[model samples]
Target: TIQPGTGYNNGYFYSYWNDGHGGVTYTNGPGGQFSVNWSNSGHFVGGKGWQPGTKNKVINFSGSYNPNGNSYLSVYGWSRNPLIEYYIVENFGTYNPSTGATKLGEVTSDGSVYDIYRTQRVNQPSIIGTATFYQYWSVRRNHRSSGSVNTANHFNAWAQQGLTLGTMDYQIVAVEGYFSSGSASITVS
Candidate 1:
């Protein structure tokens, strides 16, 4: 069933349908595994990792990804002080997030090349209420279903491009669907 709030299961944190619509469902599994399905205008995200996330750990993930519409499979998280939202996109459907964003630079990590981009959100809802902040993205050149993300590499690259991250927040391997439909079974280690 679709849960409308947030909770912790096993060791993972999950937030669902808070800013979403339509139909969505989630199934929690053991340890680092979980499955989510959504249709219509549904938004869902969940993953295993740390609260007040660290910046230097390597995150490894594997999944059976089946996104039929606009969706994202990524390492999604937020930050404070600077108030930033970030995504290390592993796979996506329909929409290529890089469209119309400044191509700040690129980084090669985890055996793939990712094009880095930065975009600003002006006075939008954020982890710290309504605010303005920057969003950092590392979009993989070749989409994959499973991989290792040496997050430090992306962080370093973003720093070099003048993109700053503040105190780390909740970092997790997440699945999100916006005005779209899709499903995924993900495992993070």
Candidate 2:
């Protein structure tokens, strides 16, 4: 769980960017704005709608006035909204080859601490070769602020995970986002 903090004026926020090794990078937007980037294999959990631009984008939230509500972008398939702010969470999971079952890993939340689980697939004699691992997601509108008219707002991105398969390695990815308020729109550049 990594919460950079409340985005007040405008600038860039460096969060976790998956580049195989998994590190941090800066995300910039026009008008002193800040956006999210999940890289090529990153997944987006929630929002209304989203798209890809020159840089990876995820969970775009924008509006004029204020929904007078709160919304959220949760990964691992969950979201919520309260007041006039948005909160998001990203959940991580993996599958065990030896057990032939999927296991839930950790939950990511903004402004909080979370534990990250390493990928470990046990060999299953009866399960054939290697177990297939996949990541899924879901989202919800906890609450939406009232009174406001915003426009040109958007968010989108791809998800990423660290995994090695013999000589081939891969990462997981997804996309999500939404639009709120009267005529407000979320746009991707």
Candidate 3:
């Protein structure tokens, strides 16, 4: 079910907007799951998404690398009523550093020490970019080379702090790349 140019797979879609950064090489392994291979450019090359639910699940992502620009494993979803969203990025790349977002203190979850940032990427006309969210990010500061992941408890841990996340909107576990070129294969469960 892996199409060369098709962007939708499994019940999700492959998101690629800024193509000028570089071209993306998507390889669908095992299932139609995509693994982004950087060939040049760095504008959020690729990733996949899951449907929304209040359920708890663990997401695992591991990959090989030549350190393609900026890479990461992240979780972001929406909330009802106010219609806001948030993200917790387990960063693996180095670029786009933030020092302007509000400091919402810190809480340890999923075996990593994350410096949480509260920021939002506003979309024009309400349909061009990631939604405006009261983002609660718990990030792992240092870069990781490879391994397993524990993203299951993030919901429970953050929800305890009153970060309203309902319906899930969808969860995603992806291997994304920024500017540069290299080839890699990622198998996700």
Candidate 4:
């Protein structure tokens, strides 16, 4: 449903299927790009996909982007069956993750206020084996390029409201650019 048209793009391979992740037909990633990075896009470490109910995620990143470039740190996982689409930081995009999502509420952590939204993510054909209730957290006004966040803390905050993140299947901190044609990057480690 996104761009490289679901194939290879330059030095980037969409999904590291050989290593066993479970995106692309399976998927992994992080880095700097001059412009061609997201001509399509991929997911995970070295493109390896993630699993569920593992360790809590500590997401971090920092960098510069061209005027139209957009990126963010995201924790995507499937707990049992349905996926948990959580946002650590939703920055630099025409549409934020909250778009089309119902406003669930708000939660604050480490002095940063997070706005939560509930949305439906239907993965048709069930090739990925899951649909989702996307929970987005807007960082309010913290737009700095560098920062670290604990995904577990965010999930726990939502747990109070009975929203379980379940098990994490795939987690990627990537930069997604739409018609970017812009220079921007940073390691999503």
Best by the lDDT measure: 1
Write down the TM-score of every candidate.
0.94, 0.20, 0.69, 0.61
TM-score (C-alpha) between model 3 and the true structure: 0.69
* Candidate 2 residue-wise lDDT, 24-136, digit = tens: 22233353233333322222221222211112223333432122112122321111110011122232123111133232233332223333222232442111334433322
What TM-score number comes out for model 4? 0.61
Give candidate 2 misplaced runs (Cα > 4 Å): 1-12, 21-26, 35-60, 63-139, 142-189
Model 4: worst 10 consecutive residues (lDDT sum): 17-26
* Best-to-worst ranking by lDDT: 1, 3, 4, 2
Evaluate residue 71 in candidate 4 and report its C-alpha lDDT on the 0 to 100 scale: 36
Q: Which candidate is the best by TM-score?
A: 1
Candidate 2 is scored at a TM of 0.20
lDDT of 3 by residue, 129-187 (tens): 54554556666665453444455455556666665554455455555555655555544
After aligning candidate 2 to the native by TM-score, how far in Å is the CA of 35 from where it should be? 4.7
* C-alpha lDDT of candidate 4 relative to the true structure: 0.45
lDDT at 154, model 2: 11
